[PDB]
Amino acid sequence: KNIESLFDYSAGQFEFIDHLLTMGVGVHFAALIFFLVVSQFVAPKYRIATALSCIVMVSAGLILNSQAVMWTDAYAYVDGSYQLQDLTFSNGYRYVNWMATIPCLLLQLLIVLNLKGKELFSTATWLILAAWGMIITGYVGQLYEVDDIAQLMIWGAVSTAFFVVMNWIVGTKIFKNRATMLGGTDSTITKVFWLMMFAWTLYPIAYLVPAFMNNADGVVLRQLLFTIADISSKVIYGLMITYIAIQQSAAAGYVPAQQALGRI
């Protein structure tokens, strides 16, 4: 049901996609160790924001690892090209993983925005419901990326509605709570918003690839877009969230944070 299954791949195409996924694994698990070691310099009220980056690194790293092995399982070099065998490859498992990873990305944002208690629980709940609506409708949509492009487009429009509303909740909370933030991170959090708008928008572009580039090179392009998007939305994002957490920790008087920033 996926466009990947439609084509044979050149050695170059096949190996490049393998390398993209493998590099993806390496970057996320390398970042994992960084987040782990810097977590001790985060104040208790923000430390979970850095823990969530560890959780996202392993979750994302595992899905990329799984995709890479699925890729090599599904294709074998036969008569001069990589051809589909008995096992299958699908990006559908990425969508399932987003059900977990996107709530984690959203939660760590709410934490460094200094949301607490009732507002935190209510905002997270609405955000996660919007996100799940987006992911589920998008998942249904990509079931038709070969059979019914029109249906892909309509489910995509519904998903985009959830996306836009989710982004509005995010922006509203960011620009409202920006003033509460310490150590100059009121400025930093503004860049985080724009990073999210940029990086998360790469995913619907990848979703539309079967509509505007239904060939083997389109398959490469989509994996390339996912790679840019994953690294930006999880790793670069996580680094900014952790920076914000440490900076606010230091400004709040947490001595390990002050000491850590002092060494650099």
Ligand X SMILES: *C/C=C(C)/C=C/C=C(C)/C=C/C1=C(C)CCCC1(C)C
- Spatial distance between the Cα atoms of 167 and 259, rounded to a whole number of angstroms: 36
- Spatial distance between the Cα atoms of 22 and 64, rounded to a whole number of angstroms: 7
Instruction: Kindly report the backbone phi and psi dihedral angles of residue 235, in degrees, each rounded to the nearest multiple of 5, phi listed first.
Output: -80, -55
| Choice from 7, 35, 144, 207 touching ligand X (CB under 6 A) | 207
204 binds, among ligand OLA, ligand X, Cl ion, none (CB under 5 to 8 A by kind): ligand X
45 binds, among ligand X, Cl ion, ligand OLA, none (CB under 5 to 8 A by kind): Cl ion
Chain centroid offset of residue 125 CA? 19
| Choice from 31, 43, 49, 229 touching Cl ion (CB under 5 A) | 43
CB of 236 vs ligand OLA, minimal distance in Å: 5
- Spatial distance between the Cα atoms of 242 and 35, rounded to a whole number of angstroms: 8
Please, what is the angle between helix 216-230 and helix 11-38, to 10°? 10
Q: Per rule CB under 6 A, is residue 210 in the interface with ligand X?
A: no
43 binds, among Cl ion, ligand OLA, ligand X, none (CB under 5 to 8 A by kind): Cl ion
Q: Per rule CB under 5 A, is residue 47 in the interface with Cl ion?
A: no
102 binds, among Cl ion, ligand X, ligand OLA, none (CB under 5 to 8 A by kind): ligand X
| Residue placing its CB nearer to ligand X in the complex, 18 or 230 | 230
Contact between 93 and 71 (Cβ < 8 Å): no
Residue 116: Cβ-neighbour burial (10 angstroms; 0-12, 13-18, 19+)? exposed
| Choice from 69, 70, 84, 154 touching ligand OLA (CB under 6 A) | 154
User: Two tokens at 180?
Assistant: 């509460």
User: Two tokens at 239?
Assistant: 């680094």
Q: What is residue 1's three-state secondary structure?
A: coil
CB of 83 vs ligand X, minimal distance in Å: 28
223 binds, among Cl ion, ligand OLA, ligand X, none (CB under 5 to 8 A by kind): none
User: Two tokens at 23?
Assistant: 């590099």
| Residue placing its CB nearer to ligand OLA in the complex, 19 or 116 | 19
- Spatial distance between the Cα atoms of 138 and 30, rounded to a whole number of angstroms: 30
CB-nearest residue to ligand OLA: 133
Q: What is residue 78's three-state secondary structure?
A: strand
- Spatial distance between the Cα atoms of 11 and 82, rounded to a whole number of angstroms: 7
Q: Per rule CB under 6 A, is residue 33 in the interface with ligand OLA?
A: yes
Using CB under 6 A as the criterion, which residues of the chain lie in contact with ligand X when the complex forms? Answer: 98, 101-102, 105, 134-135, 138, 141, 156, 159-160, 163, 200, 203-204, 207, 230, 233-234
Interacting residue ranges for ligand OLA, rule: CB under 6 A: 12-13, 16, 33, 36-37, 40, 129, 132-133, 136-137, 140, 151, 154-155, 158, 188, 197-198, 201, 220, 224, 227-228, 231-232, 236, 239-240, 243
